[PDB]
Design an enzyme around this catalytic site. Structure first.
Site, PDB file in Angstrom:
ATOM      1  N   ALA A  64       0.815  -1.204   0.000  1.00 46.10           N
ATOM      2  CA  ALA A  64       0.000   0.000   0.000  1.00 46.10           C
ATOM      3  C   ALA A  64       0.852   1.259   0.000  1.00 46.10           C
ATOM      4  N   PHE A  66       1.737   3.090  -2.748  1.00 48.66           N
ATOM      5  CA  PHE A  66       2.311   3.434  -4.051  1.00 48.66           C
ATOM      6  C   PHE A  66       1.161   3.846  -4.961  1.00 48.66           C
ATOM      7  N   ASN A 113       8.233   9.219   5.070  1.00 49.25           N
ATOM      8  CA  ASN A 113       7.074   9.917   4.517  1.00 49.25           C
ATOM      9  C   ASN A 113       6.102  10.310   5.610  1.00 49.25           C
ATOM     10  N   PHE A 117      -2.350  10.279   4.566  1.00 46.64           N
ATOM     11  CA  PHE A 117      -3.532   9.682   3.963  1.00 46.64           C
ATOM     12  C   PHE A 117      -4.156  10.638   2.949  1.00 46.64           C
ATOM     13  N   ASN A 149      -6.605  -1.270   0.860  1.00 47.65           N
ATOM     14  CA  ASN A 149      -6.258  -0.836   2.206  1.00 47.65           C
ATOM     15  C   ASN A 149      -7.083   0.376   2.606  1.00 47.65           C
ATOM     16  N   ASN A 180      -5.417  -0.731   8.942  1.00 53.27           N
ATOM     17  CA  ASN A 180      -4.204  -0.493   9.691  1.00 53.27           C
ATOM     18  C   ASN A 180      -4.572  -0.217  11.143  1.00 53.27           C
ATOM     19  N   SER A 183      -0.792   3.527  10.382  1.00 53.26           N
ATOM     20  CA  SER A 183      -0.101   4.737   9.896  1.00 53.26           C
ATOM     21  C   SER A 183       0.479   5.518  11.058  1.00 53.26           C
ATOM     22  N   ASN A 185       1.115   8.633  10.668  1.00 50.33           N
ATOM     23  CA  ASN A 185       0.869   9.990  10.228  1.00 50.33           C
ATOM     24  C   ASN A 185      -0.570  10.438  10.392  1.00 50.33           C
ATOM     25  N   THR A 186      -1.353   9.727  11.192  1.00 46.24           N
ATOM     26  CA  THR A 186      -2.680  10.188  11.568  1.00 46.24           C
ATOM     27  C   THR A 186      -2.912  10.057  13.067  1.00 46.24           C
ATOM     28  N   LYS A 219      -3.231  -4.504   9.470  1.00 43.09           N
ATOM     29  CA  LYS A 219      -1.850  -4.113   9.216  1.00 43.09           C
ATOM     30  C   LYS A 219      -1.313  -3.392  10.445  1.00 43.09           C
ATOM     31  N   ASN A 248       3.877  -1.942   8.765  1.00 46.70           N
ATOM     32  CA  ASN A 248       3.928  -0.562   8.264  1.00 46.70           C
ATOM     33  C   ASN A 248       5.304   0.047   8.532  1.00 46.70           C
ATOM     34  N   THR A 249       5.443   1.335   8.231  1.00 46.42           N
ATOM     35  CA  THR A 249       6.683   2.055   8.510  1.00 46.42           C
ATOM     36  C   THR A 249       6.890   2.243  10.003  1.00 46.42           C
ATOM     37  N   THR A 321       9.695   0.517  -0.967  1.00 42.19           N
ATOM     38  CA  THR A 321      10.875   1.386  -1.053  1.00 42.19           C
ATOM     39  C   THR A 321      11.916   0.872  -2.019  1.00 42.19           C
TER      40      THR A 321
HETATM   41  C1  LIG Z   1       5.729   6.872   0.382  1.00 45.30           C
HETATM   42  C2  LIG Z   1       4.971   5.816   1.192  1.00 45.30           C
HETATM   43  C3  LIG Z   1       3.642   5.852   1.404  1.00 45.30           C
HETATM   44  C4  LIG Z   1       2.920   4.855   2.135  1.00 45.30           C
HETATM   45  N1  LIG Z   1       1.568   4.900   2.251  1.00 45.30           N
HETATM   46  C5  LIG Z   1       0.960   3.919   2.880  1.00 45.30           C
HETATM   47  C6  LIG Z   1      -0.483   3.847   2.940  1.00 45.30           C
HETATM   48  O1  LIG Z   1      -1.217   4.719   2.425  1.00 45.30           O
HETATM   49  N2  LIG Z   1      -1.027   2.795   3.583  1.00 45.30           N
HETATM   50  C7  LIG Z   1      -0.275   1.752   4.180  1.00 45.30           C
HETATM   51  O2  LIG Z   1      -0.885   0.871   4.726  1.00 45.30           O
HETATM   52  N3  LIG Z   1       1.070   1.816   4.098  1.00 45.30           N
HETATM   53  C8  LIG Z   1       1.685   2.810   3.506  1.00 45.30           C
HETATM   54  N4  LIG Z   1       3.023   2.829   3.400  1.00 45.30           N
HETATM   55  C9  LIG Z   1       3.786   1.713   4.003  1.00 45.30           C
HETATM   56  C10 LIG Z   1       4.146   0.621   3.034  1.00 45.30           C
HETATM   57  O3  LIG Z   1       2.967  -0.099   2.619  1.00 45.30           O
HETATM   58  C11 LIG Z   1       5.052  -0.422   3.711  1.00 45.30           C
HETATM   59  O4  LIG Z   1       4.327  -1.034   4.827  1.00 45.30           O
HETATM   60  C12 LIG Z   1       6.352   0.122   4.249  1.00 45.30           C
HETATM   61  O5  LIG Z   1       6.831   1.196   3.415  1.00 45.30           O
HETATM   62  C13 LIG Z   1       7.441  -0.901   4.418  1.00 45.30           C
HETATM   63  O6  LIG Z   1       7.828  -1.494   3.177  1.00 45.30           O
HETATM   64  P1  LIG Z   1       9.106  -1.060   2.332  1.00 45.30           P
HETATM   65  O7  LIG Z   1      10.268  -0.975   3.338  1.00 45.30           O
HETATM   66  O8  LIG Z   1       9.245  -2.105   1.267  1.00 45.30           O
HETATM   67  O9  LIG Z   1       8.738   0.293   1.747  1.00 45.30           O
HETATM   68  C14 LIG Z   1       3.697   3.807   2.691  1.00 45.30           C
HETATM   69  C15 LIG Z   1       5.064   3.806   2.497  1.00 45.30           C
HETATM   70  C16 LIG Z   1       5.726   4.747   1.748  1.00 45.30           C
HETATM   71  C17 LIG Z   1       7.206   4.641   1.549  1.00 45.30           C
HETATM   72  C1  LIG Z   2      12.220   7.390  -7.970  1.00 42.59           C
HETATM   73  C2  LIG Z   2      10.973   7.197  -7.132  1.00 42.59           C
HETATM   74  C3  LIG Z   2       9.920   6.419  -7.576  1.00 42.59           C
HETATM   75  C4  LIG Z   2       9.845   5.723  -8.892  1.00 42.59           C
HETATM   76  C5  LIG Z   2       9.374   4.432  -8.967  1.00 42.59           C
HETATM   77  C6  LIG Z   2       9.213   3.791 -10.184  1.00 42.59           C
HETATM   78  C7  LIG Z   2       9.567   4.476 -11.358  1.00 42.59           C
HETATM   79  C8  LIG Z   2       9.318   3.838 -12.737  1.00 42.59           C
HETATM   80  C9  LIG Z   2      10.261   3.884 -13.758  1.00 42.59           C
HETATM   81  C10 LIG Z   2       9.939   3.359 -15.001  1.00 42.59           C
HETATM   82  C11 LIG Z   2       8.679   2.870 -15.273  1.00 42.59           C
HETATM   83  C12 LIG Z   2       7.720   2.851 -14.277  1.00 42.59           C
HETATM   84  C13 LIG Z   2       8.027   3.364 -13.028  1.00 42.59           C
HETATM   85  C14 LIG Z   2      10.018   5.782 -11.249  1.00 42.59           C
HETATM   86  C15 LIG Z   2      10.176   6.437 -10.048  1.00 42.59           C
HETATM   87  N1  LIG Z   2       8.792   6.299  -6.824  1.00 42.59           N
HETATM   88  C16 LIG Z   2       8.717   6.840  -5.598  1.00 42.59           C
HETATM   89  C17 LIG Z   2       7.590   6.578  -4.825  1.00 42.59           C
HETATM   90  C18 LIG Z   2       7.473   7.068  -3.536  1.00 42.59           C
HETATM   91  C19 LIG Z   2       8.521   7.809  -3.011  1.00 42.59           C
HETATM   92  F1  LIG Z   2       8.460   8.188  -1.832  1.00 42.59           F
HETATM   93  C20 LIG Z   2       9.641   8.075  -3.777  1.00 42.59           C
HETATM   94  C21 LIG Z   2       9.759   7.600  -5.078  1.00 42.59           C
HETATM   95  C22 LIG Z   2      10.889   7.787  -5.875  1.00 42.59           C
HETATM   96  C23 LIG Z   2      12.023   8.654  -5.397  1.00 42.59           C
HETATM   97  O1  LIG Z   2      12.818   8.336  -4.561  1.00 42.59           O
HETATM   98  O2  LIG Z   2      12.115   9.868  -5.978  1.00 42.59           O
HETATM   99  O1  LIG Z   3      -0.346   8.284   4.050  1.00 48.98           O
HETATM  100  C1  LIG Z   3       0.574   8.134   4.843  1.00 48.98           C
HETATM  101  O2  LIG Z   3       1.244   8.999   5.456  1.00 48.98           O
HETATM  102  C2  LIG Z   3       1.021   6.762   5.325  1.00 48.98           C
HETATM  103  C3  LIG Z   3       0.125   5.832   5.684  1.00 48.98           C
HETATM  104  C4  LIG Z   3       0.602   4.557   6.184  1.00 48.98           C
HETATM  105  O3  LIG Z   3      -0.132   3.651   6.530  1.00 48.98           O
HETATM  106  N1  LIG Z   3       1.976   4.449   6.267  1.00 48.98           N
HETATM  107  C5  LIG Z   3       2.902   5.411   5.919  1.00 48.98           C
HETATM  108  O4  LIG Z   3       4.109   5.214   6.027  1.00 48.98           O
HETATM  109  N2  LIG Z   3       2.388   6.607   5.436  1.00 48.98           N
END
Ligand SMILES: Cc1cc2nc3c(=O)[nH]c(=O)nc-3n(C[C@H](O)[C@H](O)[C@H](O)COP(=O)(O)O)c2cc1C
Ligand SMILES: Cc1c(-c2ccc(-c3ccccc3)cc2)nc2ccc(F)cc2c1C(=O)O
Ligand SMILES: O=C(O)c1cc(=O)[nH]c(=O)[nH]1
Ligand SMILES: CCCCCCCCCC[N+](C)(C)[O-]
Length: 360
Positions: A64, A66, A113, A117, A149, A180, A183, A185-186, A219, A248-249, A321
């Site tokens: 979730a 992305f 981040n 939401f 989610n 969840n 989060s 962030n809420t 979650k 989650n994060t 990530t």
């Molecule tokens: C930019 C960003 C936004 C996220 N938004 C959500 C979200 O809306 N809902 C959620 O359940 N998790 C959210 N997450 C958490 C991810 O689903 C995941 O649980 C977490 O980033 C750990 O996985 P990773 O280390 O592979 O990123 C978000 C994470 C990132 C990096």
């Molecule tokens: C680069 C990136 C991408 C991304 C992923 C996929 C692609 C990609 C490239 C080619 C085709 C499709 C997708 C391009 C860019 N997604 C994010 C999402 C969340 C965030 F916090 C940061 C990022 C960031 C970042 O660090 O700037």
């Molecule tokens: O929208 C967000 O800030 C968010 C939600 C969530 O569940 N996890 C996260 O890292 N960010």
């Protein structure tokens, strides 16, 4: 660009994109490119998993956050993910926090981040999913399920009712739903209160017609106390929650972070979260006696990372990530590496490895 070359993306394209764009802009661009299928591995039978009432063709999903609003689901399957989770989605549209709200920690292979939401809201996402509902039914039958989610609005006066609304509106369009506890962030997002919330969620899910009745997962954060974890395990077993997404994060800041932006408020993801998440999977698997499916998430960027979470108790894994650093080719990389490691460690497939560390 078209080949899917892991080295070209990881060493050249992605770093160049990150140097040109702030991370939220890059995220938006990524969702746009993915939604159009502008994208650069053949799933073997070893990677198939049956859980949550569904076949998953491979165990590697997109976490979730992305595709928050369900705009890029088909493109994410084209990238090679075995399942897609959209959201979080809140009942009403809301903007989320002020920008900037996403921060790269390149030296740590991490992100912080505080999106808060940001969401198009249930109605918009409902109509988006309805437009491809039969395409999704075919994908699901083909082993490519969809998770949704559910979040809560910032100014909601009744959190359980926000989740209940999500169940009623998007439940019928999902193979699984996620709530969840977690989060960072809420708001304030005792044990009786989780029990109250989940009882209401499950009652609403059970009231949907049988072909429209999704699994329900919870979650959880990586920052829980031992008491919290024991209490969650107890409630999950008492109510028959279908699964857990761990984790989650983190709101922690592990010793050793180097990025300049390490002290920004928000949830930390990526490599520094990885082993905190794996250990939380391990604990929840033991507390639920291996009877509750876990989706393991946090710092997965290789086959080894995926298999460590599977061996700790995950039936499926997600990443996010890693996609931001290494791009689309990371999905096939993880799958290829995971298949190789399964063979190397004497597993017939993913299923045989689930929870294997607990049996040694
Ligand atoms: C930019 C960003 C936004 C996220 N938004 C959500 C979200 O809306 N809902 C959620 O359940 N998790 C959210 N997450 C958490 C991810 O689903 C995941 O649980 C977490 O980033 C750990 O996985 P990773 O280390 O592979 O990123 C978000 C994470 C990132 C990096
Ligand atoms: C680069 C990136 C991408 C991304 C992923 C996929 C692609 C990609 C490239 C080619 C085709 C499709 C997708 C391009 C860019 N997604 C994010 C999402 C969340 C965030 F916090 C940061 C990022 C960031 C970042 O660090 O700037
Ligand atoms: O929208 C967000 O800030 C968010 C939600 C969530 O569940 N996890 C996260 O890292 N960010
Ligand atoms: C999100 C920006 C990424 C920039 C380059 C993306 C690569 C285009 C993919 C090429 N192709 C479709 C032909 O395979």
């Amino acid at each position: 660009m078209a080949t899917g070359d892991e080295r070209f993306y990881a060493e050249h394209l992605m770093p160049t994109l990150q140097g040109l764009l702030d991370p939220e802009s890059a995220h938006r661009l990524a969702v746009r490119f993915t939604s159009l299928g502008l994208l650069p591995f053949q799933d073997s039978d070893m990677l198939e998993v049956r859980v949550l009432g569904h076949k998953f063709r491979n165990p590697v999903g997109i976490a979730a956050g992305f595709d928050k609003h369900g705009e890029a689901v088909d493109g994410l399957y084209k990238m090679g993910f075995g399942f897609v989770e959209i959201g979080s989605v809140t009942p009403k549209p809301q903007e989320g926090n002020p920008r900037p709200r996403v921060f790269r920690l390149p030296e740590d292979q991490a992100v912080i981040n505080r999106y808060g939401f940001n969401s198009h809201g249930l109605s918009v996402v409902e109509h988006r999913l309805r437009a491809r509902q039969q395409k999704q039914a075919k994908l699901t039958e083909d082993g490519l399920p969809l998770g949704v989610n559910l979040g809560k609005n910032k100014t909601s006066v009744d959190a359980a009712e926000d989740y209940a609304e999500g169940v009623r509106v998007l439940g019928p369009l999902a193979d699984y739903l996620v709530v969840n506890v977690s989060s960072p962030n809420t708001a304030g997002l005792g044990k009786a209160e989780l029990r109250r919330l989940l009882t209401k969620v499950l009652q609403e899910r059970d009231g949907l017609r049988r072909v429209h009745r999704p699994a329900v997962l919870v979650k959880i954060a990586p920052d829980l106390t031992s008491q919290d974890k024991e209490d969650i395990a107890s409630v999950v077993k008492e109510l028959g929650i279908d699964g857990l997404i761990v984790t989650n994060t983190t709101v922690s800041r592990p010793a050793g972070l180097q990025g300049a932006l390490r002290s920004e408020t928000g949830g930390l993801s990526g490599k520094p979260l990885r082993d905190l998440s794996t250990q939380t999977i391990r604990e929840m698997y033991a507390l639920t006696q291996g009877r509750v499916p876990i989706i393991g998430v946090g710092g997965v960027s290789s086959g080894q990372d995926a298999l460590e979470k599977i061996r700790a108790g995950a039936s499926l894994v997600q990443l996010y990530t890693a996609l931001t650093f290494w791009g689309p080719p990371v999905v096939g990389k993880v799958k290829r590496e995971l298949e190789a490691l399964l063979k190397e460690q004497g597993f017939g497939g993913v299923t045989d490895a689930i929870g294997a560390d607990h049996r040694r």
